Amino acid sequence: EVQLLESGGGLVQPGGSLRLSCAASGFTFSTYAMNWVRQAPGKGLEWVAGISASGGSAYYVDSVEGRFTISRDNSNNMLYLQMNSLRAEDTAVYYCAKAVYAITMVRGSITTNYYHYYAMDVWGQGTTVTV
Amino acid sequence: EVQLLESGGGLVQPGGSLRLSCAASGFTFSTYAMNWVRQAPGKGLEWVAGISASGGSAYYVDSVEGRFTISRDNSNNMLYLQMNSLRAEDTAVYYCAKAVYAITMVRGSITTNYYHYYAMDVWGQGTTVTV
Amino acid sequence: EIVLTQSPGTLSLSPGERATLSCRASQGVSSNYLAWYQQKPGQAPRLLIYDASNRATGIPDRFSGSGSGTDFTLTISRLEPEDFAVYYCQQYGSSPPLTFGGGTKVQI
Amino acid sequence: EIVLTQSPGTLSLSPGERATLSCRASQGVSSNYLAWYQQKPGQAPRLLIYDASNRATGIPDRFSGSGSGTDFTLTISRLEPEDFAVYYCQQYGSSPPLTFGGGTKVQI
Amino acid sequence: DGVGSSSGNWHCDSQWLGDRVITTSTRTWALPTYNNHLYKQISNSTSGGSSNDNAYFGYSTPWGYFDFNRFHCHFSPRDWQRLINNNWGFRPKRLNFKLFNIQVKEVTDNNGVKTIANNLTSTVQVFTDSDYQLPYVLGSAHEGCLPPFPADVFMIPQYGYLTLNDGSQAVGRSSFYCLEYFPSQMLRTGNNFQFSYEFENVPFHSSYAHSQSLDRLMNPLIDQYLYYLSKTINGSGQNQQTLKFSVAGPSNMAVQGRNYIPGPSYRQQRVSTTVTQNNNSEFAWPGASSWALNGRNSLMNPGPAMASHKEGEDRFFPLSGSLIFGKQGTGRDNVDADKVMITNEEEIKTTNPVATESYGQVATNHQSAQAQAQTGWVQNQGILPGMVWQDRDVYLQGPIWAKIPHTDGNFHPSPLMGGFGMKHPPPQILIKNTPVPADPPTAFNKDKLNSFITQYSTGQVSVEIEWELQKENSKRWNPEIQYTSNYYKSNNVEFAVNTEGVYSEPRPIGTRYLTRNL
Amino acid sequence: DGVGSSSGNWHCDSQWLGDRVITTSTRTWALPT
Amino acid sequence: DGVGSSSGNWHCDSQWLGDRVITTSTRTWALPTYNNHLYKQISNSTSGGSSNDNAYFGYSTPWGYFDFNRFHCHFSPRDWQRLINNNWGFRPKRLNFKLFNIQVKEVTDNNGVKTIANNLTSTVQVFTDSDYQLPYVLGSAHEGCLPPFPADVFMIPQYGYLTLNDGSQAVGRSSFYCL
Amino acid sequence: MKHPPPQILIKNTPVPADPPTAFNKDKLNSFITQYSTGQVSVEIEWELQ
């Protein structure tokens, strides 16, 4: 079964840099787009960053732009989120998430290209970061 | 049901030659590659020898190379392992190995040639050899 | 960022009753591509419906979804106890940022 | 001989818990062709998964497998009592010798 | 022409006519859909490798290409023997290429069980790049050739190219190519394709070994009329300086004046196949000979053509000096030495310096009453007037031609991995399945269609080459060395299939057996 | 003409001749109902 | 020529003209795929027989071959009677051979129940060895002839040959042929 | 006969099953299952004594 296991989160002072890592298994990793989702205490979920299966295209929410860098390693099945200049409001739980579509899919007589961003099928458990 | 039944193992002095015979039923012996697996007491299983379905090609582990001979008789559905120059380390349990695939397989529209070495679907019970 | 608003906030209904949720988009959502997620206390969120009506694999058959344009609905029929949780709508139909709805809570 | 190492050794987890096993290959395993075997005390080993995900016939449906390149995983979901045993990974993807992994033990 | 009619026949033959040979080979190919009809930017970051020496930027394309650029595509092993035992040289002249019996297939997969059907209306596209407007990848020794053994069915490889990079990024000078931007011929199942090509004039590849060496060219019975300096001192003690001169003659052949000197050299590190004689450290990369381009290091491989080892020492080989081929069944990474076949260039030791030796010595100072004569070792030596050398050998397994880079200047443009250098080589032949979209939606949408019917194609290819021969004229009295099979019994015939149907080539076969005078 | 025969070839090119240019473009289309 | 057109007609006849007879026979054949498109080295060890008198080395090929080398391929029993009661001698003069109405089939097997369909674009390959460059097996009295009775449908036999052996091993003088 | 009736050889041309979508150098081992059938006619003129 697909498993997303993230580690490297924790408490740190404001202004600091924290590099969050995620380990995936159960699927071909280079064929999926990956996401980071964030939930502050008592508040709803906030999509933060997402990255193309190839890694060449990486997007961010408006607030964290320039501070966070999302990256991945297709050989190591590893998803990375490294943070710079942390703030009082960056404190939350951080989730790994996997898109429900692979970049190419076969159904019946049809082969389909999915290169956009899609709903998140599998989630990691979350790892807390306190600023 | 597929059955691998081996006999001819037992205790013998070092330097001696012991011949192990195996009996198989419930499948076409000629079309399936066969393997010999040996496990020492309190140790992980070790793959010792591999034989092609034709019998033309035989493979052995590096440690026992040149001391063990593997042969099969298609007509008699018998798989044999010949042991010469036995050593203390050699004392282990020897299990007959049956390949999961046949040299040719039909699956709907396609016919496939499998002439390599494949995962072992069926096992014999094992027969002990003590040196 | 185009916004998702959930019509009911902190809604409570008795078990065994139909549950109808509504997520409203300020802008049309391109080729559907909306997603409903369920989160339970101290538990990672869970995918329910992706696109408009499309149900995820391990999901009970009582969950349904529909919508087009700016109006989307998550329906829960034959309500049960495990269905008490906070619900969300996700919009992936545009270019990122992907934005969740504000969140909606279903009580007893 | 290209080597298989099983990272978890003599692992003990409570029954009913998800079990994840990883086998590591020094060099890429050609076109998958990895195999997971289960052995029980005084009992002949048993095929579980061959190639990457492919499950053997008489095997419970709770056993799963995946992997590519140098990293492979055996997953056991909804753990049960008979699942306590020593596990192995086999690499047939290269030319022989076929080499088993070192072996890994799952306790109570 | 028609669905029920065949568009070509099978031709595999050799025709030996006088001073020329004509080879023809037919194979069966299969073309998949690559990238599901997409062009994609690739880089070392999309791959994930981080090292500066390995960085790249480029594109992968939906197209495939045909590669016949190895000699075993055109020569059976008996043909190759027949070539190399009787001929001093050969070279290509003309080419004929056919593509016929096209079959496009539709694959449907309801539950993991594939169904395959004919799609009679689908096309394949093919063109040659006859103006050399694409990046040319046929000269990099890539896999994907027409297979040596005619009964094997091969997969057409995917075309991709590189352009300028900085790190993993591009620059404004980087070029992007669309192969749709060329005219091409479209083929339904009744259509066939052909073209012919004329090779440009190239030298005959020398396929002989010198029976004489560059330093022995003298008459052994006669003196020179030239003098060399034999002695600088009378004897022991002080103030013994003198100048003594002797005739160079049969007894001292090392000092005779010579008109021609050995060719150029760039020293390679020496490795032994007896591993205990090798040093206990990792030096594969660190001890390698290399060249640098724009800050990145490339291995010098195989490098300039040099004798592999000294006489009598066949256990040694240059580290990146020789082309190395794998045996049938050998894996991709970290195989042992018995899994590979290492060629050696020893036949050229008559004119070419040894790869693991210095070129020679030069004087480093002015000797004087207060200073002894000093020398130093020449580890690399460029072309000098009066050098002669032999190029590298070609193999049954090896490449035939390369494209000479388009540049202001080049010197002796013979491809270093061996074969015939050409400014206009055989052109690249590109092929793809024409995409057939799956059903579009019933309301207009401006996006490109991302959904396609799953297809692949297959067919036949024939390639015909006329080769010009240079016949051996020798007056040598005693019999030559000839490539031969060995009579002694074995489990398998060499250059045959085994019991599992696996064809193999057990050894590399060079071209140099016959001899010539120097 | 025939089912197994192709009714046209792919032409994408530009030809710059003196005082005139000739463009040609081929695309693949899909028509629904 | 075309899918919906026939490429030949059925001819079974005898024509007795003076000092000569002309026989013609048509049969229906079926060619499988042999060895799943492989050449394979075979020997008495791949078979398993151990005796020196029986040892061999050779190859099996994907190809089949036609065998008309028995007299009942060309003569009905009445024709043979008509031949042997009236004539002191006979001998062959000319041969004509045709291969026509080719049909290639695709077999699909989802659950043990075979479905068969036409594959209209597939080819068959045929050649004669007119330079006698292959090993010649037509003179060993093998089975696989065109059958004596014209209504029977026959299977094309598989071509295979032997070369020099020592025991089950080959020698350097052994030849391998790719057809 | 030193030159008997020549051997007549026949085979089905292999039609490979769908190849993978990434290049692999191996020969294709997977084929569409096929067989062929047809008619043969042979005509011999015999001289009588």
Numbering used by the authors:
A (entry chain h), B (entry chain H): 20 to 150
C (entry chain l), D (entry chain L): 23 to 130
E (entry chain A): 219 to 736
F (entry chain B): 219 to 251
G (entry chain E): 219 to 397
H (entry chain E): 640 to 688
Q: What do the paper's sentences say?
A:
The AAV vectors are composed of non-enveloped T = 1 icosahedral capsids, consisting of 60 viral proteins (VP), and package single-stranded DNA transgene cassettes. A major challenge for the utilization of AAV vectors in the clinic is the presence of pre-existing neutralizing antibodies (NAbs) in a large percentage of the human population. The presence of pre-existing neutralizing antibodies in large portions of the human population poses a significant challenge for AAV-mediated gene therapy, primarily targeting the capsid leading to vector inactivation and loss of treatment efficacy. This study structurally characterizes the interactions of 21 human-derived neutralizing antibodies from three patients treated with the AAV9 vector, Zolgensma®, utilizing high-resolution cryo-electron microscopy. The antibodies bound to the 2-fold depression or the 3-fold protrusions do not conform to the icosahedral symmetry of the capsid, thus requiring localized reconstructions. These complex structures provide unprecedented details of the mAbs binding interfaces, with many antibodies inducing structural perturbations of the capsid upon binding.
The two 5-fold Fabs differ in their binding behavior. Furthermore, the VL chains of both Fabs interact with the AAV9 capsid in approximately the same region. The 5-fold binding Fabs in this study bind offset from the symmetry axis. For the 5-fold binding Fabs, the contacted aa are more spread out and are located in VR-I, -II, -VII, the HI-loop, and VR-IX.
